[PDB]
Design a protein around this ligand. Structure first.
Ligand SMILES: C[n+]1cn([C@@H]2O[C@H](COP(=O)(O)OP(=O)(O)OP(=O)(O)O)[C@@H](O)[C@H]2O)c2nc(N)[nH]c(=O)c21
Ligand SMILES: *[C@@H]1O[C@H](CO)[C@@H](O[C@@H]2O[C@H](CO)[C@@H](O)[C@H](O)[C@H]2NC(C)=O)[C@H](O)[C@H]1NC(C)=O
Length: 246
């Protein structure tokens, strides 16, 4: 398991958490020096449990699929909650078995669905460590509307930070003050699958992407990523989604 405590949290302890999260995702191979998540994992080993504690020390446990860093559901006291998708219902067979009741959320785990349920795109939703404390608090008591926004915060401050060093740094900058994600943050989130696939297809194309990936950079400018010498590949991305799962 991995854990993160918002009480006493600073850029450094958040960093350790993101490192611990990445370290808990298995790989047998690295591709252009980037860990390649597994094609699949059988049984309960498929799910990582993240123990998150808010400022007051209350806690939720979040179930994460180690092949794709997708959050499947979470446990709040004696109730488990799962996204309304076959993958999460499959996860429910393995995690939080001991919960008193299991609630299926009235949405699946994707950004579009969650933004509809929350009432705002994530461009407008502040993220940061304080926002993560708010999200943990919100998830402790069922409210499907509030939970959508909380889960949008949670996914970004965990899974997305694990996937991109830039995103991890963005959250570290927001350790004491939330701010809506940069356009580069949104762009990277949106391109993870695409990037993961082009990096793998470059393996036998001399490091050249079969298809250029369009991104917004740190200055908020639109750049074209065409090969593995790009800083997005050499410095930023930390985990690759396996092409088997694309
Ligand atoms: C398809 N899918 C993706 N995710 C993750 O939840 C977030 C919202 O899901 P998404 O499908 O909107 O992701 P996105 O468009 O960013 O696609 P990607 O670049 O290929 O990852 C994603 O960004 C992933 O973090 C998903 N999470 C869950 N729980 N279930 C899913 O079916 C699922
Ligand atoms: C490989 O990617 C690099 C970028 O990392 C490309 O070089 C960039 O492209 C043009 C000049 O050709 C400039 O706009 C950028 O400043 C360049 N970046 C750097 C870091 O030099 C390069 O063209 C790509 N190679 C191929 C074959 O597509």
């Amino acid at each position: 398991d991995v854990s993160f405590r918002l009480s006493g949290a600073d850029p450094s302890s958040y960093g350790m958490f993101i490192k611990d999260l990445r370290n808990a995702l298995p790989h047998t191979e690295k591709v252009y020096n980037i860990p390649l998540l597994l094609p699949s994992v059988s049984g309960a080993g498929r799910y990582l449990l993240m123990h998150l504690f808010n400022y007051d020390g209350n806690t939720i446990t979040v179930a994460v699929d180690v092949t794709n860093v997708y959050i499947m559901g979470y446990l709040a006291l004696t109730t488990s909650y799962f996204f309304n998708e076959p993958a999460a219902d499959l996860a429910s067979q393995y995690v939080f078995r001991s919960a008193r009741r299991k609630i299926t959320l009235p949405y699946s785990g994707n950004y579009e669905r969650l933004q509809i349920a929350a009432g705002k795109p994530r461009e407008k939703i502040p993220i940061g460590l304080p926002a993560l404390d708010t999200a943990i608090s919100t998830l402790l008591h069922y409210d499907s509307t509030a939970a959508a926004g909380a889960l949008l915060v949670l996914i970004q401050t965990t899974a997305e930070a694990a996937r991109f060093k830039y995103i991890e740094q963005q959250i570290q900058e927001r350790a004491y003050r939330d701010e809506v994600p940069s356009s580069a943050t949104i762009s990277l989130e949106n391109s993870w699958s695409g990037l993961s696939k082009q990096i793998q297809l470059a393996q036998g194309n001399n490091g050249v992407f079969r298809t250029p990936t369009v991104l917004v950079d740190s200055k908020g400018n639109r750049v074209q990523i065409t090969n593995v010498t790009s800083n997005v590949v050499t410095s930023n991305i930390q985990l690759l989604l396996n092409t088997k799962n694309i």
